[PDB]
Design a protein around this ligand. Sequence first.
Ligand SMILES: [K+]
Ligand SMILES: [K+]
Ligand SMILES: [K+]
Ligand SMILES: [K+]
Ligand SMILES: [K+]
Ligand SMILES: [K+]
Ligand SMILES: [K+]
Ligand SMILES: [K+]
Ligand SMILES: [K+]
Ligand SMILES: [Mg+2]
Ligand SMILES: [Mg+2]
Ligand SMILES: [Mg+2]
Ligand SMILES: [Mg+2]
Ligand SMILES: [Mg+2]
Ligand SMILES: [Mg+2]
Ligand SMILES: [Mg+2]
Ligand SMILES: [Mg+2]
Ligand SMILES: [Mg+2]
Ligand SMILES: [Mg+2]
Ligand SMILES: [Mg+2]
Ligand SMILES: [Mg+2]
Ligand SMILES: [Mg+2]
Ligand SMILES: [Mg+2]
Ligand SMILES: [Mg+2]
Ligand SMILES: [Mg+2]
Ligand SMILES: [Mg+2]
Ligand SMILES: [Mg+2]
Lengths: 135, 187, 94, 141, 46, 51, 39, 51
Amino acid sequence: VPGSLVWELVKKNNCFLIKQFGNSNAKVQFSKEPNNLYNVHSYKFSGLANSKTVAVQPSAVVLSTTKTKKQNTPAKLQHKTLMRKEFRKMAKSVKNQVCDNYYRPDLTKPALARLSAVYRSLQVSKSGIKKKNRQ
Amino acid sequence: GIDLVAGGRNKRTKRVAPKSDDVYLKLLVKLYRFLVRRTKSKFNAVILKRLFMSKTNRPPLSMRRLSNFMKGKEEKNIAVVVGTITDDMRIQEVPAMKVTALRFTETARARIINAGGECLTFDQLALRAPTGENTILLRGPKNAREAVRHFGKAPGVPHSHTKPYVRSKGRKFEKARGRRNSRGFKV
Amino acid sequence: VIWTESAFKKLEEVYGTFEAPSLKKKGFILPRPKMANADLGRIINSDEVQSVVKPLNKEVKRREKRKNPLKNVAAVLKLNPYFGTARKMATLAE
Amino acid sequence: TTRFKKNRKKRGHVSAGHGRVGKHRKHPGGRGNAGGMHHHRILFDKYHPGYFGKVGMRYFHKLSNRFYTPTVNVERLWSMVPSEKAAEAKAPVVDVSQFGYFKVLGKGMLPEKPIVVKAKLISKIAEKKIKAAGGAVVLVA
Amino acid sequence: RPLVSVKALEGDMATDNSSSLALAEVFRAPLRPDVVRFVHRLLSCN
Amino acid sequence: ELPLVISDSAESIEKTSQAIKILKQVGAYADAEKAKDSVGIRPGKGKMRNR
Amino acid sequence: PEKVILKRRREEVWAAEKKQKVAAEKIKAAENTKVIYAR
Amino acid sequence: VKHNNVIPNGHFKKHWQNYVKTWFNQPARKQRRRIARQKNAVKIFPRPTSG
RNA sequence: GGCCGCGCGCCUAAAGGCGUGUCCCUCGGGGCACUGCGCUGCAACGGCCUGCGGGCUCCCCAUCCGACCCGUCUUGAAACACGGACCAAGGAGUCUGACAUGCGUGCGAGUCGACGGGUUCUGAAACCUGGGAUGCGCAAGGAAGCUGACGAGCGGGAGGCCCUGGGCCGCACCGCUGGCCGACCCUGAUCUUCUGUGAAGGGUUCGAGUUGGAGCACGCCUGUCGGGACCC
RNA sequence: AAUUGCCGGGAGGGAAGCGGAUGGGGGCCGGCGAUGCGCCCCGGCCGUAUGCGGAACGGCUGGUCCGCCGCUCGG
Ligand SMILES: [K+]
Ligand SMILES: [K+]
Ligand SMILES: [K+]
Ligand SMILES: [K+]
Ligand SMILES: [K+]
Ligand SMILES: [K+]
Ligand SMILES: [K+]
Ligand SMILES: [K+]
Ligand SMILES: [K+]
Ligand SMILES: [Mg+2]
Ligand SMILES: [Mg+2]
Ligand SMILES: [Mg+2]
Ligand SMILES: [Mg+2]
Ligand SMILES: [Mg+2]
Ligand SMILES: [Mg+2]
Ligand SMILES: [Mg+2]
Ligand SMILES: [Mg+2]
Ligand SMILES: [Mg+2]
Ligand SMILES: [Mg+2]
Ligand SMILES: [Mg+2]
Ligand SMILES: [Mg+2]
Ligand SMILES: [Mg+2]
Ligand SMILES: [Mg+2]
Ligand SMILES: [Mg+2]
Ligand SMILES: [Mg+2]
Ligand SMILES: [Mg+2]
Ligand SMILES: [Mg+2]
């Protein structure tokens, strides 16, 4: 079952999709799944309708990519790496496992953006926010 | 103020998508939307339009029609119908034909394959004939329906052979006073 | 769904296959998909499809900004390049 | 299903789609097929010619099973012959009564192969078509 | 037909060492949520 | 594996504790735990009915 | 990757044929600039 | 009557609503008939159940 | 009144701007020109930022302009035409049957498992099974007796193909002319159980016909009709 | 809720209410509105190569991570 077929089955309703404000122009949608970098309900970003996916979540930052020949076996579907180095070294590994490999090069900018937000979130976790970012 | 009808807007309606919700048909529509955008083929443009059509606008085609429309031109020619291929017991010889259709009956699929032919889907015809080269586009009989027999002029006007809507058939069901000269008139 | 082995092995006796007498359910065949290969990417990006397609086109046009063809000199130049020359012969007053 | 009915789209609109002048009344025009010769005559004449009057003779206690004669055309006879019997064929002999048929009619083309047909009844063209293919007919009861 | 492994609960008994059954043809059927939604509505009425 | 075929030994278990043990072995117990949680009163009038 | 290589070959091939179209267009545009001047 | 329809013939001019027969007891009739067949079978143990 | 996407890889000049060579034009000084790759969200300044400051879709009031009470029948309502003192809760196109067009789903010359039977450890679910003839279809016409489709062309046509506008093949649909079946009328070689048959040959006649198998089941909206039948 | 009392506020020359537009008065609000970002003395971590452990991508080469070493110096 290819990703295009899976997308049409899960597009309308989903255990991870959150919809709000009805079906007018007011509608706001998001996705809750991991391996969904921007948490957006779209084919490009969906963690359910794509064979190759990247997950950038904290724990230390865990990067996870899925194996294409292990779709039928969920227990071995995720190849996970845990990195505790400096940001640039982590940013280099994300570019290596996502861009240079040709494993979803279209996600290299969303993945680096999410790694920035996750690393920044961890930065303030150890030392509380001493300045607010309104400028 | 400018003198126009309905403001100049188009009042005719047409289908720009299939009314059905079949995901495999939605995937066919996406594929053929791409083909008519970037190949500019007249054949692909017709396929996309018929993929939107309703059930009564895509009549079934039988084997008898197919084996006669594809008579000598069954080598290097794929028959294309946007609809269903049904079987026909009234014929005995079935040549080897390449046929693509939305659906085959299990008797028609068996008849084609046993004769040496192939049954293709429209996603397979796109690989073989991306621009529809060396193909025969076919349609079933649009007006071979019992409903169409009641269409047209009213049954009670001269020169009309429209079917009436009668609950039963017999001598006591609409055969007197309007159907023969011995009772009034005969329209 | 968690299948015990006996249930899974029976799954072919029940529901059979595309062959006519191949199951318990009388007068039933497995349904056939309308699309033999639902991989849209592998059909759009096939050799046969990509060898009949025209060059890609991503030049977004827009309504050209107005440029006053009566007073804006650069505008009245691109339209009627004989403008300017007509003025000079006009200013050639004896 | 109530959610898709057009009355739900007419809530707030006074007349419910029936007009302010020619309202919705009980039975303007009568009940059922009333006035089919007086004020519904044009409708009855236009869409149901033949409706009034009496033609033909009566049949008291007309039993349907007396007139039971299922029919089959020649163009369908060879579908009753199995594949291995056609390969062996001499001509296959088909008793159409074992398939639920009484009379054999002659619409369509027979293949140019002999066939023997057993039936209670048959038309003249069906017999001519069967003989032209090299076959024969046996009348049974 | 690809083979489906059979998970063993007796991880120390292991009467055999290989067991894999061909994938049932019913698992390659088309997926039709439009007809599942239709047939589920009418069966729940019963 | 999602087709998740299990050996015919599970056909012989007869205890609920045995069933819980089988689910844990096949990795299918977090699904049963979620169902065990989330059990609650139905809001609305169906409460007052027999649901 | 042969999938990558095919795409790279054709984006250059089209781009070269795009250069020819504009290079041919400069000559046309210049010539018509003075044809309409004369008229 | 207003369009090209069949001539209507509805046999609903009497008090037909006092003579409506529903079938909500159909699955109960099936069980009652099944139960009597098993009782009759035990009443004649070796005799064939088909009469 | 609304808008904010030329300039530098030569030099000098706050900066606007100037500064090269070539051919032609005369009457003093210009004109048309060299065209090679790249990057490419206009500015300057001020007051104010926890205050008696700014804003406001909220409340009240003032002023100017505009503004007749809604619903309803009606050609025409603000009407000296009816209903309405106010508020809360309740209050009117529904259910069923038969058809029909459209649409959606399955199967397809078939389709329907609807009444029954088997089974069913959650079950008035579900699942299986009975049709070689149950219902609609697959064949008409005729009051009936009774007969029952011997297999088409033409014009226009989407699309496909070949040659470099032309040619070939042409689906659906429209139009025209036929053939065949049946009612009525005509016709008659020959065989035959003597009253049947049918080689040929037809018709300003009639059919809800054929020369296209498309239907069956279910679901929904709409429309007509029987029912209290939109409500009183 | 209709409707009523009291307290406080506002308006009123034979109705009032209503639409648009401002103003006066009131009641609100601080995501109502900023205080960070690049260069430098103080705090504090490691390439290159290695042994080892797991698990990847493409269709046999090459990849990342972690913990440990032993050279290294830029962060
Ligand atoms: K209406
Ligand atoms: K009952
Ligand atoms: K009135
Ligand atoms: K009044
Ligand atoms: K109608
Ligand atoms: K039947
Ligand atoms: K007659
Ligand atoms: K009604
Ligand atoms: K007061
Ligand atoms: Mg206007
Ligand atoms: Mg208008
Ligand atoms: Mg007349
Ligand atoms: Mg009214
Ligand atoms: Mg009326
Ligand atoms: Mg009137
Ligand atoms: Mg509640
Ligand atoms: Mg009565
Ligand atoms: Mg009046
Ligand atoms: Mg009024
Ligand atoms: Mg008055
Ligand atoms: Mg009155
Ligand atoms: Mg009053
Ligand atoms: Mg109410
Ligand atoms: Mg005749
Ligand atoms: Mg006769
Ligand atoms: Mg009433
Ligand atoms: Mg109050």
